[PDB]
Design a protein around this ligand. Structure first.
Ligand SMILES: O=P(O)(O)OC[C@H]1O[C@H](OP(=O)(O)OP(=O)(O)O)[C@H](O)[C@@H]1O
Ligand SMILES: O=P(O)(O)OC[C@H]1O[C@H](OP(=O)(O)OP(=O)(O)O)[C@H](O)[C@@H]1O
Ligand SMILES: Cc1cccc(C(=O)O)c1N
Ligand SMILES: Cc1cccc(C(=O)O)c1N
Ligand SMILES: [Mg+2]
Ligand SMILES: [Mg+2]
Ligand SMILES: [Mg+2]
Lengths: 345, 347
């Protein structure tokens, strides 16, 4: 029978947990029965031991079981997420958020997941006039009417508040930093998932493989939790319940090498202007990075329905993303999204 | 500029801390400025990194800086402690506590640091209390005990009030951490000699390193069966500390004529059962428990001899064993316990 001394003792001995132990720990955490000290000890010990896919799957599954779901039959079974763990410590413009808009504008339903954070995805969306803190019924309506929705994490995962407080108190990255992308309450079966931590990307890929999701888990070799234009990236291609590990070089599709500071973000208003520039069709490294990540999500989406050759999949993804911007569709989609939120009153 | 994210990040990156960082952390903990989550994260991360002697010395040093001291000039320069980390998981009779009484009865000043059980049925403090010894005395009365009886007991919660935040976290998480090492290293009377048991084979050397940076003569001991005492069931590893250096060796009590015992023969029970075992040994009962008590008492007498160190290792052991046995057989140990009980009752 499970207890903190047993579970923490096992982890401090550098041993993987027994089946069900991580799940028990997470139900204690999610029910308010874990003391902050227990939560912190578990988070740290799991991290230093090095979590397995099975363990993280238990944590995520339990957390999801406590989440508010979207209403039945409201999420298309081909919806995608575009999201990363964050914590790359580089402060870029909101690449995942821009890519999400472009992906949705290319005709792929997008359901994003997150929290207010210089400027996180959510904060930038608010600066653009998007309403981010909507309940399940309204996110469902948004997805139907606009092609995109946003699940505000504190609203969907209220029972995570004990863990979230501990995470702030200790500051340091832990296994808990992995859970965001794995606990999207709309349960999209495809995604482009960034991981700031190189070894943990493989673990996240394993969890998606166990779910039979179609996902690209990506880590820029400059340490970004996005597909980068500044260097090569590592991609774990998850499809058919199997993980394929690949090096990805954007130079192969004709992208010039950018510098990290060309992707630097600022406060919410600065990042909002960046979004507007890219959707208005401005060329440069920000567009290039957006188009790259949008294409990755489109490739992952394609993987739900077919196994297509990697390189042609990418060529079509890049083309779809470029056209979504250049036809005005992406700019129009953001306007529609703002319009939707203003209609709620 | 020190901070929790900086220090925790370093530890989770498996890196030793910079000089002063462990001390900063410990002072935050001891002043009530660390959140329980920060205390737990620190303890666990330090444990999994593997603490160094320098880091543990900072932790213990800071903890001592917040302790109540004994009054000036009340601890003899040659006082000895006999105490371990506990946590060996065996639930034995209280070997350190019996040894301490025997050592005091042999004429060596003893100032014992101790505490209730953490995961055993009866800790040394519990057993002492069951024997009628007063465990809850303050600095002045501990000093009087030492002068009038030849032994005193510093009850950790009375001498280390500021450790309450750390203690509570330790109980909430259960798992042993670097904090389990600190009890033997923070005797508030600061005796210069000691027989110090460590249940964690990997960390005994670290504890020895901490003592080597002090003006100390100590035997840090780990039974090769896992006991945080010198064992009679097999060999023990001893880290001998003196003059700022460490001499690691394998010790075998069969060399002194001790028969090999089985661990179950050293098994304890509740405070009442463990108090009964004390009375049996001090009354002259022969057997495995006596043997282990005599062995550990002698070990403490050897550490004490290492302070004003004429004697070489082997002759020191021979004399320690003679003195420890004689303290029991002449009734001196039984008499000294009665005297310690009388002292506490005379208020
Ligand atoms: O502050 P950090 O921990 O570095 O994280 C920066 C952002 O990255 C993640 O979001 P997401 O990938 O959805 O948004 P973005 O890429 O558009 O910023 C995370 O939810 C934050 O919004
Ligand atoms: O419950 P545990 O964690 O196993 O610890 C058992 C005892 O070990 C330590 O004492 P000490 O060495 O002073 O006493 P003893 O050897 O006489 O029991 C500790 O202060 C406990 O009292
Ligand atoms: C994801 C999440 C869920 C619930 C509460 C919080 C919080 O920051 O308190 C949070 N960050
Ligand atoms: C050593 C010590 C100091 C202060 C409080 C406690 C406690 O157990 O609560 C304690 N164990
Ligand atoms: Mg991102
Ligand atoms: Mg002991
Ligand atoms: Mg012991």
């Amino acid at each position: 029978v499970p207890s903190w001394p047993q579970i923490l003792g096992r982890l401090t001995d550098n041993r993987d947990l027994a089946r069900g132990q991580a799940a028990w720990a997470m139900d204690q955490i999610m029910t308010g029965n874990a003391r902050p000290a227990q939560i912190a000890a578990f988070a740290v010990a799991m991290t230093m031991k090095a979590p397995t896919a099975d363990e993280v799957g238990e944590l995520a599954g339990v957390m999801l079981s406590h989440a508010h779901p979207l209403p039945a039959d409201t999420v298309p079974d081909d919806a995608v997420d575009v999201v990363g763990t964050g914590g790359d410590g580089v402060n870029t413009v909101n690449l995942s958020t821009m890519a999400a808009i472009v992906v949705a504008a290319a005709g792929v339903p997008v359901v994003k997941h997150g929290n207010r954070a210089l400027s996180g995805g959510a904060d930038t969306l608010e600066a653009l006039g998007v309403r981010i803190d909507l309940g399940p019924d309204l996110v469902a309506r948004s997805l139907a009417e606009v092609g995109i929705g946003f699940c505000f994490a504190p609203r969907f995962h209220p029972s995570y508040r004990h863990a979230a407080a501990v995470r702030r108190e200790i500051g340091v990255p832990t296994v808990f930093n992995l859970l965001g992308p794995l606990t999207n309450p709309a349960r999209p079966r495809a995604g482009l998932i960034g991981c700031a931590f190189a070894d943990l990307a493989e673990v996240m890929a394993g969890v998606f493989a166990a779910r039979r999701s179609s996902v690209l888990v990506v880590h820029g070799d400059d340490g970004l939790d996005e597909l980068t234009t500044t260097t090569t990236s590592t991609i774990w291609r998850v499809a058919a319940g199997s993980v394929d590990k690949l090096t990805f070089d954007p130079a192969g599709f004709g992208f010039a090498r950018a510098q990290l500071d060309q992707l630097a973000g600022g406060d919410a208003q600065a990042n909002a202007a960046a979004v507007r520039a890219v959707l208005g069709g401005a060329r440069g490294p920000v567009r290039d990075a957006v188009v790259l990540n949008a294409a990755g999500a489109i490739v992952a989406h394609a993987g739900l329905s077919s196994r297509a050759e990697w390189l042609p999949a990418w060529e079509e993804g890049l083309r779809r993303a470029s056209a979504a911007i250049d036809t005005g569709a992406a700019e129009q989609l953001l306007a529609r999204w703002v319009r939707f939120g203003r209609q709620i009153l």
